Amino acid sequence: NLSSKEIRLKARPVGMPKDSDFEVASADVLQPGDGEVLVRNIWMSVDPYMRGRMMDRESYVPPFQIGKPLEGGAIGQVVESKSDKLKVGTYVNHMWGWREYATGPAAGFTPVDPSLGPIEAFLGTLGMPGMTAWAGLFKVANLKDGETVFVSAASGAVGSVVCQLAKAHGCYVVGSAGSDEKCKWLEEVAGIDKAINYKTCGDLTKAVADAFPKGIDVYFENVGGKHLEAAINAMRPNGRAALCGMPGPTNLIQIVGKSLRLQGFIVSNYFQHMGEFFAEMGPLIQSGKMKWEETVEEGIENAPKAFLNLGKMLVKIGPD
Amino acid sequence: NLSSKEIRLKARPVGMPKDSDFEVASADVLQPGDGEVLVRNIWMSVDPYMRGRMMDRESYVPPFQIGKPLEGGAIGQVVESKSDKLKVGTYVNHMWGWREYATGPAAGFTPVDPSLGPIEAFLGTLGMPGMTAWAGLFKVANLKDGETVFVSAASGAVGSVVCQLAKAHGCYVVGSAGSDEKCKWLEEVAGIDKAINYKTCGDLTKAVADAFPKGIDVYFENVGGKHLEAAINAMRPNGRAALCPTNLIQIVGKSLRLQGFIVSNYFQHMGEFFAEMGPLIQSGKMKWEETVEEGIENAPKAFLNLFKNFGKMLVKIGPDKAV
């Protein structure tokens, strides 16, 4: 009886996506079958990786399909349930975003505890970005308490959580950003020891070296290029670099010299820690030690706009 | 009561080391004090890293000293002992080479079990090169049986042991070398699946890709440069690189781990190491080449021959059985 507006891929984007590549459409709200649930979406997320999912190139993740509604992180509320394992009214996180309604088996919908924070934060700080930060910091880098931490693109969704998690563990934290406003935010809101503007600081190797008088223990990577060169130059013996984001560095020999470890990782391989993640992330949000910024568009029709604009980007669909 | 010939550093080398930088001299054989031992040296090793120890540059290892006898891996036999923890007659590994006699506290002398193999192999296959290989393969790269292995500079002291250790664990092994003779040796003696000549093979990325139809699981590094690029290009998801480029992004894509290491941080595994290295030598699955010069006076010669074929360079000093 109801309608669900969704954003479908109208045409494969070439290079950068155009607004003409997206199509707003009206779809049916299928009533749930046995073991299934129907959920009305409230918040949805737009993330950078989605761009790669719109290309036809060989990818580790299946691309989107022309004519099919796009997919992405979303927070909804269960409004109908024919499954005993998930009751009506539960707030759930899922991957069927870019739409107003979603029907499917209850397994595909993960309940989110709103005690820990606002439900939309389950797409950012309490979601995949915050979990990427936490996994890279503690499961890849093995950050011991009190170590020094260098974070590139520290004002981003992942870098901010990395910075504040390291600060919460007694770490000397230096972050990198592309503007003085982001550096002021990093130093005064995020509360890191020093923020470097890689556009104005001159030689970035020298800037990082001066920022770390005793070297770097952990390097969280989101940019690359000369940032990795500077980090390796300033890294301490047994320093670990968790690479999450990305002319290569000219000082690779030091990896052998200081016994450096450089590990790429994907957050998907660490969901088995989600509980533990929450166990740390909940309190530190309530204490005010974990802060974040949001940029919220309104209406399903503005879902493409938000995506084209790549604070953590979200789109509000339904009411709470 | 006796005299001991020694090789001392007469001058720091300028550029490449010269024969004029070394000095043969006669030193005293100090009788051991309490808790000390006097050992007659039988075998001594010369290695490339020793060159770095001859310069005054900032190094992770203290350089040699002018007027002081050089130091390096050596296998000797205890001929006098005033320590209960080390008995006379024991064959010992230590770092006071380039000389015929060594006197010092028993702690600095590690006994070597000749069951596992010839005592001189405790300077190569059963020594720091073989243990570096073993630690990088199993403690750093965590090589699971059946995985694919790419080894650079595979004809070297470390790479050969890496190749044969991986072969012993059922691994498809491709190695790189700088000459056709080294490649033939890798394929026929070491018994690896394919050897690539990085000086002649043209595009090394393409050669490595063609050598690995299903990709690389473990990459052991001994050279660097384009070898790491080729490895990263041909590495599989969750590939590990033990280290002894324009495609770094793939590290994020395939969840690659790149770890440098020094063997010093893994001595706590040596026991396990021996438990594996002994049998694989007796089975004939672990082979190596040696180049043995004779006499302490030929110790500089041997060292200078490390930069002018191949094989582990050694020089015999004392008799096989001193007591």
Please write down the HEC assignment for all residues of B277-307.
HHHHHHCCCCCCCEEEEECHHHHHHHHHCCC
Cα torsion for A129, A133, A134, A139, to the nearest 10°?
A: 120
Contact B168, B192 (CB under 8 A): no
Q: Are B110 and B93 in contact (CB under 8 A)?
A: yes
CB environment A215-248: b (16+ within 10 A), e (fewer): ebbbbbbbbbebbbbbbbbbbbeebbbbbbbbeb
Say yes or no for a CB contact (<8 Å) between A245 and B252: yes
What's the token pair of residue B97?
């080479």
C-beta pairs of A270-276 under 8 Å, 24+ apart in sequence: A270/A131, A270/A135, A270/A139, A271/A131, A273/A131, A273/A134, A273/A135, A273/A139, A274/A131
Rg, C-alpha atoms of chain A: 21
Q: What does the domain layout of chain B look like in residue ranges? A: 1-124+289-323, 125-288
Q: Rounded CA gap, B12 and B124, in Å?
A: 27
In sequence order, which residues have a C-beta less than 8 Å from that of residue B17 and are 6 or more positions away? B51, B54, B303, B304
Q: Please indicate whether, in this complex, the C-beta atoms of B254 and A264 are within 8 angstroms of each other.
A: yes
Q: CB under 8 Å to B249, separation ≥6 — which residues? A: A224, A246
Chain A segment 209-228 residues within 8 A of B by beta carbon are 224, 228
Q: Which residues contact B245 (CB under 8 A, 6 or more apart)?
A: A248, A252, B228, B229, B232
The structure was resolved to a resolution in Å of 2.6
Bridge-based pairing state of the strands B36-45 and B22-28: unpaired
- Closest by alpha carbon to B125, among B169, B92, B157? B157
User: In terms of residues, how long is chain B?
Assistant: 323
Q: Write out the DSSP string of A250-275.
A: S-THHHHHTT-EEEE--GGGGGGGHH
Method used to obtain the model: X-ray
C-alpha span between A74 and A224 (Å, rounded): 30
Q: Are A108 and A79 in contact (CB under 8 A)?
A: no
Which residue in chain B has the smallest CA separation from A256? B260
Cα separation, A13 vs A9, in Å, equals 9
In order of A125, B13, B54, B175, the CA distances from B221 in angstroms are 39, 28, 25, 10
- Beta-carbon contacts of B224 under 8 Å, excluding residues fewer than 6 positions away, are A252, A253, B152
Would you say B135 and B158 are in contact if contact means Cβ atoms under 8 Å apart? no
For residue A205, give how far its alpha carbon lies from the nearest alpha carbon of chain B (Å).
Answer: 18
> Which DSSP helix (H) or strand (E) runs through B208?
helix B204-211
Amino acid at A266: I
SS3 B152: coil
Cα–Cα nearest to A315, from A43, A69, A51, A119: A43
How far, in Å, CA of A109 to CA of A13, rounded? Answer: 30
Structure-block tokens of residue B149: 């292995």
Instruction: Count Cα neighbours of B222 within 13 Å in the Cβ-side half-sphere.
Output: 26
Nearest to B266 by CA among B140, B84, B141, B180: B140
Say whether B199 sits in a helix, a strand or coil.
coil
Contact A264 B256 (CB under 8 A): yes
- Give B39: exposed, middle or buried? Use CB within 10 Å, 0-12, 13-18, 19+: buried
CB-CB contact of A42 with A77 (8 Å): yes
What separation, in Å, do the N-terminal and C-terminal C-alpha atoms of chain A show?
A: 21
Angle at B42 between CA B273 and CA B154, to 5 degrees: 45
Measured CA to CA, the distance from residue B242 to residue B158 in angstroms comes to 12
Residues paired with residue A59 on neighbouring β-strands, in sequence order:
none
Q: Report CA-CA distances (Å) from B243 to A256, B237, B250.
A: 6, 18, 17
C-beta atoms surrounding B48 within 10 Å: 12
Helix, strand or coil, per DSSP, at residue A73:
coil
| Closest chain A C-alpha to B151 CA, distance in angstroms | 16
Long-range Cβ pairs for the range A161-164 (8 Å, 24+)? A161/A125, A161/A129, A161/A130, A161/A132, A161/A133, A161/A134, A161/A290, A161/A292, A162/A133, A162/A136, A162/A137, A162/A220, A163/A190, A163/A192, A164/A190, A164/A191, A164/A284, A164/A289, A164/A290, A164/A291
Residue with tokens 């930069």: B307
